[PDB]
Design an enzyme around this catalytic site. Sequence first.
Site, short mmCIF file in Angstrom:
data_model
loop_
_atom_site.label_atom_id
_atom_site.label_comp_id
_atom_site.label_asym_id
_atom_site.label_seq_id
_atom_site.Cartn_x
_atom_site.Cartn_y
_atom_site.Cartn_z
N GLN C 10 9.26 -52.67 23.52
CA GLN C 10 10.42 -53.46 24.47
C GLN C 10 10.23 -54.80 24.42
O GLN C 10 11.06 -55.49 24.00
CB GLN C 10 10.46 -52.76 25.93
CG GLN C 10 11.40 -53.64 26.55
CD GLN C 10 11.72 -52.73 27.89
OE1 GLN C 10 12.96 -52.32 28.04
NE2 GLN C 10 10.79 -52.45 28.74
N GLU C 70 11.99 -45.06 22.93
CA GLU C 70 13.28 -44.93 23.86
C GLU C 70 14.53 -45.34 23.23
O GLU C 70 14.32 -46.62 22.69
CB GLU C 70 13.04 -45.39 25.24
CG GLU C 70 12.64 -47.03 25.20
CD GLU C 70 12.01 -47.37 26.40
OE1 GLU C 70 12.60 -47.08 27.56
OE2 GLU C 70 11.16 -48.21 26.52
N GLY C 143 2.46 -48.35 26.06
CA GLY C 143 1.90 -47.34 25.48
C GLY C 143 2.22 -47.20 24.03
O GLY C 143 1.51 -47.05 22.90
N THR C 144 3.77 -47.18 23.87
CA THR C 144 4.15 -47.24 22.25
C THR C 144 3.77 -48.38 21.44
O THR C 144 3.43 -48.28 20.32
CB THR C 144 5.67 -46.98 22.33
OG1 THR C 144 6.10 -46.63 21.06
CG2 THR C 144 6.33 -48.38 22.94
N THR C 178 1.79 -55.78 35.71
CA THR C 178 3.11 -54.91 35.81
C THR C 178 2.68 -53.39 35.91
O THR C 178 3.45 -52.67 36.37
CB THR C 178 3.61 -55.20 34.80
OG1 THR C 178 4.44 -56.76 34.64
CG2 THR C 178 5.02 -54.42 34.56
N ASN C 205 2.20 -64.32 29.61
CA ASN C 205 3.34 -64.56 30.33
C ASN C 205 3.00 -65.64 31.60
O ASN C 205 4.19 -66.58 31.71
CB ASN C 205 4.03 -63.37 31.04
CG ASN C 205 4.61 -62.46 29.88
OD1 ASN C 205 4.64 -62.82 28.93
ND2 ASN C 205 4.96 -61.09 30.29
N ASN C 227 11.25 -65.55 25.78
CA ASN C 227 11.67 -65.32 24.47
C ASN C 227 12.18 -66.12 23.61
O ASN C 227 11.64 -66.36 22.30
CB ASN C 227 12.57 -64.10 24.62
CG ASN C 227 11.84 -62.66 25.21
OD1 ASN C 227 10.61 -62.77 25.52
ND2 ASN C 227 12.68 -61.80 25.46
N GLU C 253 -2.68 -70.27 3.41
CA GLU C 253 -3.51 -71.46 3.55
C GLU C 253 -3.75 -71.34 5.23
O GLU C 253 -4.86 -71.80 5.31
CB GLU C 253 -2.68 -72.64 3.34
CG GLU C 253 -2.22 -72.89 1.77
CD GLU C 253 -1.40 -73.93 1.36
OE1 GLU C 253 -1.84 -74.78 0.72
OE2 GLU C 253 -0.33 -73.93 1.93
N1 LIG Z 1 7.54 -61.95 27.25
C1 LIG Z 1 8.04 -60.82 27.35
N2 LIG Z 1 7.28 -59.83 27.91
C2 LIG Z 1 7.80 -58.61 28.11
C3 LIG Z 1 8.86 -58.40 27.84
N3 LIG Z 1 9.24 -57.13 28.25
C4 LIG Z 1 8.11 -56.47 28.56
N4 LIG Z 1 7.06 -57.43 28.66
C5 LIG Z 1 5.82 -57.27 29.13
O1 LIG Z 1 4.93 -56.62 28.26
C6 LIG Z 1 4.27 -55.60 29.19
C7 LIG Z 1 5.01 -54.19 29.11
O2 LIG Z 1 4.96 -53.62 27.90
P1 LIG Z 1 6.06 -52.99 27.32
O3 LIG Z 1 6.85 -53.48 26.10
O4 LIG Z 1 7.29 -52.50 28.46
O5 LIG Z 1 5.37 -51.56 26.86
P2 LIG Z 1 6.20 -50.45 25.70
O6 LIG Z 1 6.05 -50.96 24.49
O7 LIG Z 1 7.74 -50.44 26.21
O8 LIG Z 1 5.45 -49.03 25.69
P3 LIG Z 1 6.38 -47.87 26.56
O9 LIG Z 1 6.14 -48.16 28.08
O10 LIG Z 1 5.29 -46.61 26.55
O11 LIG Z 1 7.66 -47.76 26.11
C8 LIG Z 1 4.29 -55.96 30.47
O12 LIG Z 1 3.20 -57.05 30.56
C9 LIG Z 1 5.65 -56.93 30.49
O13 LIG Z 1 5.71 -57.96 31.48
C10 LIG Z 1 9.86 -59.19 27.32
O14 LIG Z 1 10.89 -58.89 26.68
N5 LIG Z 1 9.39 -60.64 27.06
MG LIG Z 2 9.03 -48.94 26.81
#
Ligand SMILES: Nc1nc2c(ncn2[C@@H]2O[C@H](COP(=O)(O)OP(=O)(O)OP(=O)(O)O)[C@@H](O)[C@H]2O)c(=O)[nH]1
Ligand SMILES: [Mg+2]
Lengths: 430, 442, 442, 331
Positions: C10, C70, C143-144, C178, C205, C227, C253
Amino acid sequence: REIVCVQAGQCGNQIGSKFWEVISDEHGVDPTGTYQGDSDLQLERINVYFDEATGGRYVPRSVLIDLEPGTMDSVRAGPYGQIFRPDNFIFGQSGAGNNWAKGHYTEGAELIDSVLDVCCKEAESCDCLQGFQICHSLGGGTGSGMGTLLISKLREQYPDRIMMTFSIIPSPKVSDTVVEPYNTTLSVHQLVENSDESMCIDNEALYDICFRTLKLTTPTFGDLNHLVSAVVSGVTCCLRFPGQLNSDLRKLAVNLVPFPRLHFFMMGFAPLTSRGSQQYRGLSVPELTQQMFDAKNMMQAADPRHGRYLTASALFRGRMSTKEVDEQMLNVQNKNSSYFIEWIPNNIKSSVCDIPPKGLKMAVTFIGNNTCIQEMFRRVGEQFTLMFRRKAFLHWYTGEGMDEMEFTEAESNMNDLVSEYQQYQDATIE
Amino acid sequence: REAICIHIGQAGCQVGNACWELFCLEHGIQPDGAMPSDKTIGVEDDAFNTFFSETGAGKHVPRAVFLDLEPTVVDEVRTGTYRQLFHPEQLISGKEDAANNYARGHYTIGKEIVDLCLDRIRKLADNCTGLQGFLVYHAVGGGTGSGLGALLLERLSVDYGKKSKLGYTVYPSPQVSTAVVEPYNSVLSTHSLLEHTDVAAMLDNEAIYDLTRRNLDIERPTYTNLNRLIGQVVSSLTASLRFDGALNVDLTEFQTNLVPYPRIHFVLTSYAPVISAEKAYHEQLSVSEISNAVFEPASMMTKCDPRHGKYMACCLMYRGDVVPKDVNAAVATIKTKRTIQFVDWSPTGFKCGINYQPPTVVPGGDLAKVQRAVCMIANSTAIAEVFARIDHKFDLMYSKRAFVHWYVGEGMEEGEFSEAREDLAALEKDYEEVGAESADMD
Amino acid sequence: REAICIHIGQAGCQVGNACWELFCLEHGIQPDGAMPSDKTIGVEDDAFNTFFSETGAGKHVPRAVFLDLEPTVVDEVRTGTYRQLFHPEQLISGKEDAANNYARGHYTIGKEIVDLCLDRIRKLADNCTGLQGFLVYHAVGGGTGSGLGALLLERLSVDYGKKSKLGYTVYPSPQVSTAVVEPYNSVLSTHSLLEHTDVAAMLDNEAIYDLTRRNLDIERPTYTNLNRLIGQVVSSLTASLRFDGALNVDLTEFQTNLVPYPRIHFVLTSYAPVISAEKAYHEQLSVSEISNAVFEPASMMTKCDPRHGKYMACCLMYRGDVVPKDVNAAVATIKTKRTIQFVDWSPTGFKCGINYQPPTVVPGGDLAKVQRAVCMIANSTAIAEVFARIDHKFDLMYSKRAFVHWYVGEGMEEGEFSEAREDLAALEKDYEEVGAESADMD
Amino acid sequence: MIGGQHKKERISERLQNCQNQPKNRCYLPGTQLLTGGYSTKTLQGNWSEERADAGYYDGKAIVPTHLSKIWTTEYTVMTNHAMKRAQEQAPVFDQATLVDIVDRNHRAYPTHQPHLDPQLPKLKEEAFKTTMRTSFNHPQEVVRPVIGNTPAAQARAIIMRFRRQLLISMEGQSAFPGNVLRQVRLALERNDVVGNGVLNVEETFRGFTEAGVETSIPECVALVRGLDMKGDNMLSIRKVMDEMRGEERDRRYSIIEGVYELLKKLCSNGVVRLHHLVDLIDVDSMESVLNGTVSSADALRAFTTQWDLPLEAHISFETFHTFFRDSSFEL
Ligand SMILES: Nc1nc2c(ncn2[C@@H]2O[C@H](COP(=O)(O)OP(=O)(O)OP(=O)(O)O)[C@@H](O)[C@H]2O)c(=O)[nH]1
Ligand SMILES: [Mg+2]
Ligand SMILES: Nc1nc2c(ncn2[C@@H]2O[C@H](COP(=O)(O)OP(=O)(O)OP(=O)(O)O)[C@@H](O)[C@H]2O)c(=O)[nH]1
Ligand SMILES: Nc1nc2c(ncn2[C@@H]2O[C@H](COP(=O)(O)OP(=O)(O)O)[C@@H](O)[C@H]2O)c(=O)[nH]1
Ligand SMILES: [Mg+2]
């Protein structure tokens, strides 16, 4: 150099309608039969498939045969149906009943003389005659029995020409008819003696083409018959257009057949790509060659990876360099050297034609002679042996008049064909 | 003075288009056969006569025949741009091809066509007053080129006798290949060609592809490029008949100087200033530089390496602004080199020719414009490698009688394979014996 | 000259959306893959090639894959505005998420999807001629991202071998959080990343929230702002491949200059002129002010204080109108400072880069337009404090096996927790030993 | 297309009482293109490929609703700026072409969509071409590298192309060298409409077309963008003419300055005027008059006119310099 087409049975007439649509489109023939093309290059070889009618019109050199007129009424009703000559439709008054013996012996010998009369009238009109092309299914009734009868008679009457067949064979997964093994076995026995070159197609392979490559949600028999019409019209393209390296059906046979019984071939056609993806990938010789050798793109259920190529041929259409073609064929032969029979120094013939099909920059059709054809016949022979030991439906055939000895002869001949392919598969230099 | 060109099959007709394009543009004949009348010309001229004859109205027509069994390529020539140049009788076409079968061309189908061809050649030879040989272009890989070329050369050799026949054949490339049956057709062709040819120039496609990739900057060449290079070679060889020069060389001198024994007539070719227009203005192109170029194997138009053999004779043709002293200094420098070796029975290894006409530039062409060029034909024992590999591929296929039923069915005895294979074995021994330095003499 | 981007889960896909928005707008490619008629006239250029490849019809398509378990985020890409830009095969989506379980991504579910991903990357890498690394975007908290990122990096590292892999990774911030299971996933991820990554860039963050509050005047930021800042950083690091400059810096380098020992590859990142339009018009922005800015902890994108450690190497990238003499004067002034300390075994502490292309301005963006910018990535012992805090949270939960039954049920041995915790403990000891102030002569 | 009207029943189908599945067009009640058990509106199964069809239509009204405005996603808010620009243009078909698309008439394979191929007309013109016809035509009938996407690079390349075209063309050659660039500048001045000496894209195109240079609208867009230094898409005539003159070599500059310093000392108070130049010039010494191809009076008359000033105007060093950079362009 004119080809005569014969269309037999339901499958043959249906495939033929799509073929003659494709050919009429490529030469710019209106569905009324009037020439409406836009370059002289179209006209100078129109004779190859068309006969000349007096004012505007051209008429196609094809014979339609069936035992019940239902199909003929369907083809006459189709969008291009008007083009066909009325005198070329020959039909009886009762169906084949899905029985080989009825189709071969009772209504066959009754009708066959009028078909031979039409074929001779058509043959003697050519200034020089090239081979015949036959479309039929092997699982049916009139297609198998009367088609093989007619093939035997034409091979008796014209033994020096070429005999080419396109043939449909029963799928391994779902039957459309219970008695498919008998009709298939008798037809393969007739074909291996009579034919010069035979192409085999599985409907299951066309479904896998549509679903995996084209991603069609709801395919229909029109799509399968369009793929078939594409390859059939592609093999003859070098006969009827200029090119840097011309080719011919006899030249294909001479380069493809090492020994006279080994004349059963696999087919493929390369530019296939889904409606979403086509904007994302341009045509090029590496892309066409890689798809061309992928077994996913081959029109039979047996896969080349379990066998070895004795010989193969590729016909390319379009304006392209010869160096890239030659080096691609060298690279494929060198990198996969274990899949090519080692006592032949070069297995691939190439040919190049200038004019691609409309709306494609380039295309290739592939013909392959691979030992994996033995797997289809073995499976059909298994189903035959299960049915025959118990006389499962034999009284129909014996009631038409057949001797049981024909079944044992046909079984033995198919088993010898499978054995010959298997021996060349496992042959060695020693 | 005159020479007659015979073009056979697909390669020979397509190479003919490039050749006649060049000869027209070099002499100045328009595609319609008429030279530009201009205002006037101060003195009368004759150089065209080697290749063209004029009608009483002043049209030019060329001394050539095009022979094919399939119509498509000759009908393509008939419908092209040069329609009015050729006489329609000269373009001879059959009904159907020899289908990569030597037997179909030689026994079944060519026997029907040969009498028309012989009647046309007779009609040409009657309209000459100093004919001095035949030039033949064909490929031995295909059916009609091998079979009809052999049959026609046999008939020509009986009817005309002593007249010379020089061939520019295209033999199969050593790993690029186009058809499966190439070894059988090339062996059977070479058997007939051995007895009935005076000088065989051998060409391969893989070398001209390599040459166009390395020297020119073309990533995706096609046959028109190769055919234009071949046309340049032919123009260089025939220039000695057609234009003024310091040291002219008649076609009988090639055979006298280049051929030591009557079977040893297989030769290799090489052309020097293959260069692009952008490279051409950064470098001088002196005599010694192009002379050094012609001996490198990267310059050759056949796939063989001459360092694995010994040269027997070389004939060097210079055209353009060259002075004999520079040619002599170059040849003496080549002679000094240690990686170039001659058989000890050939001490005077070189023949020279010098012509004043620089090479012509063709509007669509890819070569630069240059003031001088050199072309070489040379006899070397390294040409044995070309045959031994074809014969090995033949042996591989014949051990299993591969495809043989086609040849025996179309009218040929099985015995014909073994005689030809033994003749090529004898050719291999000729190249072994000729290449032997000396014996155990007192 | 080429790079391939892999976006996972995500955070990685959402940051990818901002990155590809920026790279399109910087080169001038329209959202439908075309390029307007005036960008392609008069000159012929290749700079897009690092990130885009063109079809023979001239459409542009980008060199990226999007991986998720997902559907929702990839379905947002499929139905959005950039639908036509991406090739549909590149956008790969599974059926169900890894549910914050590393075990579900790595063992159970990612094992089904991984072979499609490898086939797409292989098909991409075969259509290249100067691939020069992989860029990977993922978060280690979920997780993923942890499980599939590790599994895919392992497979990529076996198949492609020596080729470099640079990761941008969002680690769990020190007090904003989170999800509960973040420590377990981050430890287990870090175990895999140690073996199979060449440089790892760390992000928090909480730092980007602080930076957006302090420098920009935004009280209520959302993920699109963070982002876009990350996208600017990535554009700064990859600009050295794509545009002309005085001192270029190839991606190899960075790895050669920044990594002293093979485990010590985790780097801090910061960016200087993050500024609003009202402040930007009150101030000059010379080289020395932004050079002084990049070393203040208020500029960093990771929540660590560099005053608690020693620098080993710094790499400073300047883009825009800068001249090398001011960079040299600035670095000498930084070197003079007493609160900036380098380890005594690293005397020549700095690498510089200077590129002429100024940073691009995005229509909805919040950054001002500026003539010059600098971006820094640096290796420092202060990073050891982040791991110590992760280890404390892991130790607190693991002493009572607080959640372990989920991980054991989805296929994982309890032993793997202790192995990873001991490996990260060894990494802490490595940073203690490498940072030794001095060694004794006896 | 808007409102469908090509998914509906045709009159021929109604008259013939045609059923559904022979052609598989979902218009009859109770039949619908169900992908995965659901319509294409739901993201199940093969929706992506079915949405890629040439004849696909989504039932979205042009007039928007309130809840669409209220319910928006964060991604939509991020990427809405590009969407507004990207929605300006879209290909359209008439009804006959849509009938052909639905009936899938002319296709190599069932999924071939030639109407979505942007290179179809050039393919059609390119069809039926043979290798020899292209390669063996009538023989009578048949750049300094610049690197970067920067608009300055494009401007420099375009300026070099224009200079090459003017050198090969050479219109308006006079008895005294230096009339080509004068004609180009006059042509540019004539098409200014305001009087402040600036031009936009369209007037630049008209001016350069009148001056004899073959151009196109994208060329002028690129040139005006490249030479713009104040963000208004206005082209200054002085700047473009200075760039057309080019970089000046040292020897020519030395001669020009030496001649000017000589002429300065022969006047009073060091002020030089144009009648001084007209009186003191020695026109009968050029190579073009001694060889016998240009008369002396015509050459002097050409020289006097090219200044575009009255006979009493003060000629500064700038005017002298510019005049003789214009003249050096032809030597
Ligand atoms: N900077 C930034 N942080 C994000 C973003 N989306 C989620 N996070 C952060 O990343 C962490 C959550 O990780 P996720 O990416 O949601 O985990 P995932 O890869 O979706 O893994 P699954 O839940 O199993 O699908 C938290 O600390 C969130 O605050 C984003 O779009 N930008
Ligand atoms: Mg996810
Ligand atoms: N260099 C060159 N090689 C050619 C050309 N045309 C064909 N070839 C080569 O010659 C061989 C084919 O021989 P063909 O001339 O086609 O054979 P053919 O004379 O037509 O004999 P048939 O096929 O029986 O009619 C292949 O190796 C081709 O690569 C050409 O124009 N130039
Ligand atoms: N590929 C293809 N197969 C067909 C078509 N029509 C029928 N078949 C197949 O052919 C077999 C039926 O044979 P049929 O033509 O009815 O035999 P006939 O009664 O002797 O004409 C079955 O396997 C059908 O699936 C068609 O249009 N295309
Ligand atoms: Mg031929």
